[PDB]
Design a protein around this ligand. Structure first.
Ligand code: CU
Ligand code: ZN
Ligand code: ZN
Lengths: 882, 5, 887
């Protein structure tokens, strides 16, 4: 029972080829644009009217002709046509004097638009040159449904067509697009038309072009475009692109050049998403592509590397094979998320990029997918808002986690084969759910890799058509040598019976034979529950999900939880580190949902004293963060600090001062960042003094710049009780950087001062007009409240003053005000803070309506209440160590 | 696309 | 005996040319602005001091020079000058060390101001972009006396001068002005100066410039500027401007491009009037220029079209030829009002736009002009308030009606020729009323179109220098059969003899020969009364004013009123529909003034059962509305509903459910709106259920959006007993619209709920702001919500009273809207109390409000309320209700 709509185009007519010409004088900051399009189309059901899409465009003329011999051959003028647009369905209808009969026709429309300023259609972007002058560029973003903002078209992904694009623009600017340049022609006194080669069959949402004065770096058939003053930061992207494209060529067994003679990447200063996979011309926001080793962090580099991998994966999964309709958008975004980490790991083996997948995708997916509002992977949509809303954690991380599950179940070679079958089959066409299963099946037909009578499709449908994921319960009738397992839907929040039955692949491992590295032994639960007969002593632990490859949580009897717990106390590395990470996150969420005694889960985490690897500590960091945030303003908070001190103080035998030795790995860097972060949060004076000194050493001249891989921590803590000269130094550094990611990190870092007078002055700089972008001014507010309770207070004190909320609201919106109020609410934990909040609401007067005020109080009250709820009592209790 | 972190 | 003043500038000096430069950084929301002006002027009477205007400006320096060889020759520094300004007369005086002798001089002032926020001088406006950011722009409105707020000048319309304007602003913004761009020049790191070509001779009130990040669309020598996210709503305006400008060029025989190489139109988000005719750069409030066929009504489209036609008319009547002084402001606003409809009809022939003139202008003008307070067209003024106050129904609709009268009396070709003579004569200069009469006369000199003794001026002076208008009485001698006619001034209120004698053009038409379409037979009454000898049988009716072209009402003896009445019962279309409309409105007002037996007028209206056209029903609507409002809360009300139910139910054989077929005319649309609006007001369950379903169909998904041309009705009534989902739907739809006219219509529509809890919550939204990314009302819109609620019906008044009983609620109410808004709503409530039971509610409120209300205002409310309660037992009110003894 999913009702949708009549927002779908009439099915009477169908595109064949678009011949698009656009003119823009964006070099002059002229923001109108003009266009003509010649659309070759097929009529299937005889009609008087051709219906396609338009948002915002104003037609000036239109006419039709027939093509009596196909697409080559001459047209014969039928007549001028009538145009009208429905603003709600965004259907434009061209109406002929005659009724057209099933054949090939040529529609020709002249039209005029304007460049968006919300980063969505054909829009404007800009940057500031080294001499202070602002320079404009026109660029595109169509995915979802915005190709209709640049030219009238059949804007649905299943209606693939060829595209021949030409653009008129300033002689002094360059145009690029999906396809290579076919030819320049200078015109008038000032201008030029750039012509592009015809595309293959593709969807409108992937069409793209850019008109700018940018520069390129290159290597063979691949370039990277950047604003001229970012040229030195484009080297990494070009390396990564070459390596990643090749890995994918080989692995999938279809080279990219099978269909395209070049692949460009471009960094666009104003960009809504992280990046967009337009065939042959992939757009990025700057933070997703630029890297500068003097100031960019290992995290930043990882973001560039994964994003490139993500969008290159789309050249096959999305571009070559596109979704028939958005219901199957996971066919794109699931594979892109998986290969975001997998292709990258194949492209830089030994940098342990693939480890990042378990915490950044699997566990991340389970968090959102444990909510009652989560959707099934297959889920339809009709309106533009409904379509955007599909681009969520289910389309991305969930899909990517289940695909990773399938990949392991099928085996590497079968997997590759399956995909090559799929891609080959649906090449230059649309795909749905079942066509993928067909492909994967073919590569294992007769090979007896699945139990007899079971399809690839039988399995995937249980995961694809059902919201959420299961928890697999494992109960042992111990001293008696059996195990019972059973499955129910997992919620973060509640236990609610569910009729659907996931076909779940499982395996398991016991204490004497502790091998987690093979995947030959996959078993299936295809019913609600089952008895597993077995060999294992009541003294040995068992653990079910090998390296958390299966997309499900696992719960055990308190017995087996305690066996496990003991085993990791005596020898902390006795279980695979990903499985330790599974146990940590599983225990955490099982306790929160009330499927497991909190006391048990907390007992299980004491083992971390001895822990030394990246995955488990990353998992732990999420549980600890939650507890930290709920205890913070409360009396019991001291005992939490003590408890966590106990957990880390050992592993705090790393180097955080100068951490960076050339030999320490990616994973090490993450680990160092997580542990030092905690130590500094807790006020380890060693941590606070070293960071403080480093910053002082760089701001003073005494010493070198702080290495980027340690800057996040060092600049934030280190600023805690720093003096005016170090605050100003860091502030001037940010204002002089032309690097967005740097700027953001420094804005956050300034936010960590404990000095309320610094914070308020800092906030004042974000108001009025220094060179913040809008997003950065908002960022300053966020830095201040995210710094700690002292910034929150600084912010509240600021907003109490009515003249100050006046300035605040005139330069940021009221939405930024309501946003900050929510943030403050999320961080009030005690009576004294609740007073401060209520005082602010009241002081703000007519800016806060009753509804919102009620909401703020509600989220704040939930925090105060939390301290004496069952959780919270259970926890304050447990923190009665002695 | 790739989303914003 | 009209006493005025010394607010007029000294007459010693006179402007020649202004050289104006202004700088604004409004792109940054900086609201200060700086300027320099170089004023070439002539001294006529030797003086030590040059007096001109200033409101709000602060001078920083000033000096004078002489120009011995004129305006081309070189200046020779005389000295720095002293400045002082009188706040009351708004005169700034520059005093020279030397006494200047009759010649040409150059005054040079530097000064600084600040942008207004009441939409009046050089002021600030703003909009929200497609990315949620708020964008500012600087713009102008000078008419009346506000040019003095942007630069020191001789701010009187008779002191025409040339203007050369330049503006410094952000490289990322554009500046436009009266004249075309002469050249850009980039400066500093981020700013630019835009230079404009020199204007012709023109008045200061017509100068204009706008600094914004707007966009243009174009067609030939014309553009339309809009905020970037309104780009597609600008289409109609650009079409209409091209067509209308050409009609006027041909019709007046002086092309616009005789004086100006381009004409821009711009839609300004914050704008006090509907529009302003600045030569070459016409400003509009968005509702007067934007049109979007998906949501805009046919009314909305008509407002745009008439407004463009109105303001383009001014390019000749106001700009090329300007009033010598505001006493003759009708020289502008009369012609603009006439051509508001006439040029538009010529531009879109067959859309029956000209029909709208009789009800929207003529009858509308007579309503106000029948009051004892009305002014003569020629009427002088001195203070800024007195000048604004002249921009009233006499300057606009009355003048426009008499000009229409003259036009028909002179004939098209003579009229055209006359106007061309006028415009040509006074081109680039000031005009007074006599110069117009000269022009019109010349085009008919010797042509014997007027009787022997008589000038164009002789006639027009009777209409121009006298308050009000006449009623022409026609008393019949049925047998002989002769007719006597006579004229007296018409009042709405009273019958009082008057000594002045209008020179009145008349004609007439009788039942056998029923032709109302020619205007060759004009006759004149130039005395108080006259005997008309004639041929017409005592059985045939006569009717005097052909298509109500003459600006006068007409009364008949009761027998003729009864002949007429009978004739329209047998064949409702036997008389020209404009004349039916005349009779309806005349009968109505004659009865109200006690010049005619109410019983007769009511008897005459019964013919409406069979009526089927736009004009008469629009007329009827006014009479019916009045009776409806007086009877509403009263016992006799039932009998009124019956009586009207009789009048419509026939014509309620239209489609209101889905009314809109592509072949329905403009006039049909107005008609459908007027009829269906009555049926729904009365509770026709067919009407109430159909509108309700439509609104449901759209708010559900079940069905289409309601077509705009019936949204007004459908969204209001269909909301009557609608549920929370339809109310919330329409409410969210209003919140998300960025279209001001749409928003207003939806605010009114939500007002029509009968659910008092909805209404109060609704009102609550207008107080304080809204939730999250959510959007709020403009100030004008908040006020609009209050008005929607009380205008919705007695239930919304009751909801509003209950709201204001709560003291904490009047507190919020008053902090975000004025106390002035409170009193205003109180008066509105008082106007709508017609019951003891309502009087009780009112008195309870007054008392509940306590110290918010003083004695005077509490007395007043009771007074107006009491005036209602009393009406029921006046002679009118007893005469009526009585007449409501149907059968
Ligand atoms: Cu300012
Ligand atoms: Zn993607
Ligand atoms: Zn006007």
């Amino acid at each position: 029972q999913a009702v949708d709509e009549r927002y779908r185009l009439p099915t009477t007519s169908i595109p064949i080829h678009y011949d698009l010409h656009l003119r823009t004088e964006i070099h002059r900051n002229e923001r109108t644009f003009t266009g003509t399009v010649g659309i070759q189309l097929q009529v299937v059901q005889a009609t008087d009217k051709l219906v396609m899409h338009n948002r915002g465009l104003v037609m000036s003329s239109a006419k039709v002709s027939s093509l009596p011999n196909g697409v080559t051959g001459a047209p014969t003028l039928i007549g001028d046509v009538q145009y009208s647009t429905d603003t709600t369905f965004e259907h434009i209808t061209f109406t002929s004097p005659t009724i057209l009969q099933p054949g090939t026709y040529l529609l020709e429309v002249a039209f005029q638009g304007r460049l968006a300023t919300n980063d969505d259609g054909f829009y404007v972007s800009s940057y500031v040159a080294d001499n202070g002058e602002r320079r404009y560029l026109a660029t595109t973003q169509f995915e979802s449904t915005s190709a209709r903002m640049a030219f009238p078209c059949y804007d649905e992904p299943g209606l693939k067509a060829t595209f021949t694009v030409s653009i008129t623009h300033s002689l002094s600017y360059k145009a690029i697009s999906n396809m290579p340049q076919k030819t320049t022609t200078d015109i008038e006194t000032d201008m030029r038309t750039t012509f592009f080669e015809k595309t293959p069959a593709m969807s409108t949402y992937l069409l793209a072009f850019v008109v700018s004065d940018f520069q390129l770096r290159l290597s063979g058939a691949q370039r990277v475009y950047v604003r001229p003053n970012a040229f030195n930061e484009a080297t990494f992207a070009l390396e990564a692109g070459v390596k990643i494209l090749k890995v994918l060529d080989d692995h999938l067994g279809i080279p990219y050049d099978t269909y395209m003679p070049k692949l460009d990447q471009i960094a666009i200063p104003d960009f809504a998403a992280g990046a967009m996979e337009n065939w042959g011309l992939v757009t990025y926001r700057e933070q997703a592509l630029l890297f500068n080793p003097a100031v960019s962090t290992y995290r930043g580099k990882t973001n560039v590397a994964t994003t490139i991998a993500h969008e290159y994966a789309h050249q096959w999964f999305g571009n070559l094979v596109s979704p028939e309709w958005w219901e199957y958008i996971w066919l794109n975004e699931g594979f892109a998320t998986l290969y975001e980490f997998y292709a990258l790991d194949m492209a830089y083996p030994g940098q342990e990029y693939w480890e990042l997948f378990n915490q950044q995708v699997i566990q991340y997916a389970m968090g959102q997918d444990g909510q009652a509002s989560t959707r099934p992977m297959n889920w339809n949509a009709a309106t533009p808002g409904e379509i955007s809303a599909l681009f969520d954690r289910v389309a991305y991380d969930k899909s990517g986690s289940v695909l990773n599950m399938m990949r392991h179940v099928l085996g590497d070679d079968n997997w590759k084969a399956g995909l090559k079958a799929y891609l080959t089959d649906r090449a230059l066409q649309g795909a749905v759910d079942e066509q993928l299963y067909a492909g994967l099946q073919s590569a294992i037909e007769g090979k007896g890799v699945l139990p007899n009578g079971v399809t690839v499709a039988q399995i995937m449908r249980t995961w694809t058509n059902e919201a959420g994921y299961p928890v697999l319960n494992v109960r042992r009738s111990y001293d008696t040598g059996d195990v019972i397992i059973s499955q129910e839907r997992f919620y973060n929040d509640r236990k609610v019976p569910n009729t659907n039955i996931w076909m779940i692949p499982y395996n398991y491992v016991h204490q004497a034979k502790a091998d987690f590295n093979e995947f030959d032994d996959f078993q299936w639960l295809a019913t609600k529950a089952a008895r597993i007969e077995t060999t294992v002593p009541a003294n040995e632990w068992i653990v079910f999900n090998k390296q958390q490859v299966g997309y499900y949580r696992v719960n055990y009897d308190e017995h087996n939880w305690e066996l496990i717990t003991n085993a990791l106390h005596e020898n902390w590395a006795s279980i695979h580190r990903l499985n330790r990470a599974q146990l940590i996150d599983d225990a955490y969420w099982l306790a929160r949902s009330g499927r497991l005694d909190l006391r048990v889960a907390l007992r299980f985490m004491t083992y971390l004293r001895n822990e030394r690897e990246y995955a488990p500590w990353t998992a732990a960091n999420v549980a600890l963060t939650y507890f930290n945030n709920r205890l913070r303003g409360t009396a019991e908070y001291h005992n939490f600090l003590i408890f966590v001190d106990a957990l880390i103080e050992d592993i705090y035998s790393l180097l955080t001062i100068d951490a960076v030795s050339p030999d320490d790995t990616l994973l090490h860097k993450y680990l160092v960042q997580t542990i030092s972060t905690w130590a500094c949060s807790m006020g380890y004076t060693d941590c606070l003094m070293k960071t403080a000194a480093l910053l002082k050493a760089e701001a003073s001249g005494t010493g070198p710049a702080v290495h980027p891989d340690i800057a996040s921590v060092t600049y934030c803590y280190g600023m805690r009780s720093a003096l005016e000269s170090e605050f100003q130094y860091l502030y001037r550094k940010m204002m002089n950087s032309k690097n967005l990611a740097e700027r953001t990190m420094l804005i956050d870092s300034l936010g960590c001062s404990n000095n309320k007078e610094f914070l308020k002055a800092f906030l004042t700089t974000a108001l009025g007009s220094i060179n913040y972008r809008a997003d950065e001014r908002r960022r300053v507010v966020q830095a201040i409240y995210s710094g700690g309770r002292t910034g929150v207070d600084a912010l509240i004190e600021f907003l109490m003053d009515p003249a100050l909320v006046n300035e605040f609201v005139s330069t940021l919106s009221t939405s930024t005000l309501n946003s900050a109020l929510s943030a403050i609410a999320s961080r009030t934990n005690n009576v004294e803070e609740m007073n401060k909040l209520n005082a602010l609401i009241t002081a703000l007067g007519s800016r806060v309506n009753s509804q919102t005020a009620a909401n703020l109080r509600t989220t704040a009250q939930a925090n105060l209440d939390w301290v004496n709820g069952f959780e919270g009592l259970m926890l304050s209790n447990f923190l009665a160590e002695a | 696309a790739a989303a914003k972190a």
